[PDB]
Design a protein around this ligand. Structure first.
Ligand SMILES: O=C(NCc1ccccc1)c1csc(N/N=C2\CCCc3ccc(-c4ccc(OCCc5ccccc5)c(C(=O)O)n4)cc32)n1
Ligand SMILES: O=C(NCc1ccccc1)c1csc(N/N=C2\CCCc3ccc(-c4ccc(OCCc5ccccc5)c(C(=O)O)n4)cc32)n1
Lengths: 145, 145
């Protein structure tokens, strides 16, 4: 009977579950599975204890369906003005999470896919060079896993 | 500089983090993000309290690099002999998790991708019809989320 793109969804569900079960037994599906878990935990710790010290970077953006990457990029550049470090990379993820929650709060969940694409562009273009210079994602997992 | 398939990895990392942050605020990235979290929790509860009651279905398989889907399918059919229900679908995921841990235990992590593909095939072919008949994944999330 008619399955649709649920077939691809079912493949990703299996991978998610198996990744979780391996991690519980001290194994890892992949480097990126280990990074996902370390980043979830690092973000929670940043938001709990450290984010209150900083100005609210989200006050700088009012994302609308007309907002372009360039506006996001100029604001995120403020986090990295005085250099990239792992803590500012964790703050960048937290920031994007807060933009997404704020967008859903304003009944504009349609913008979340845009914010995700912008974050991926900025990560690939601005941060991946520093990450590769500084021991790659394995170093992040060593520090925050 | 040279990025490679890390660009696609970086897109999936962003989605994973944003999904987590939305879920903490009572929002959801997607139906499948909600299913992933409910299935992780359902699997843990099955394994903690209910799996010990059943015979060890993994004793039925000795997966090698020569093992074919047909061998997996005949053993998983035993879980569903007396019908599909949500509990047996949770047990199917737990089963696959246990096969993966056992494969890594035997220094054959190369087989985990195979087990994942077999699980996706069996889910799409044998279980998705029942799932769609029984209110789809939303019903599962309602019961286990
Ligand atoms: O999510 C955000 N705002 C929304 C919000 C949420 C709740 C309540 C109100 C508003 C958010 C994320 S961000 C931010 N502003 N941060 C700025 C302002 C612009 C300039 C700036 C410049 C440097 C840094 C920064 C950030 C993190 C830093 O380190 C984190 C260390 C750590 C890692 C892992 C776990 C815990 C702690 C550092 C640093 O020490 O260098 N420096 C931060 C901002 N706002
Ligand atoms: O992972 C497994 N084995 C490896 C293992 C792990 C640890 C230790 C030793 C071996 C495993 C997963 S499975 C299984 N065997 N299960 C079988 C044997 C074959 C026949 C069979 C036939 C029906 C069912 C079954 C399974 C689940 C069931 O419901 C679960 C309800 C629930 C849901 C969500 C959270 C908690 C509980 C039911 C049922 O009540 O109908 N029936 C189960 C097996 N083995």
């Amino acid at each position: 009977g008619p399955l649709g793109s649920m077939s691809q969804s079912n493949r990703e569900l299996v991978v998610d579950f198996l990744s979780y079960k391996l991690s519980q037994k001290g194994y890892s599906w992949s480097q990126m599975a280990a990074v996902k878990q370390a980043l979830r935990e690092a973000g929670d710790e940043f938001e709990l204890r450290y984010r209150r010290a900083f100005s609210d970077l989200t006050s700088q953006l009012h994302i609308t369906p007309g907002t372009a990457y360039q506006s996001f990029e100029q604001v995120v550049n403020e986090l990295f003005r005085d250099g990239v470090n792992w803590g500012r990379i964790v703050a960048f993820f937290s920031f994007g999470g807060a933009l997404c929650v704020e967008s859903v709060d304003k009944e504009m969940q349609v913008l979340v896919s845009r914010i995700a694409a912008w974050m991926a562009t900025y990560l690939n273009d601005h941060l991946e060079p520093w990450i590769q210079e500084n021991g790659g994602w394995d170093t992040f997992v060593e520090l925050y896993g």
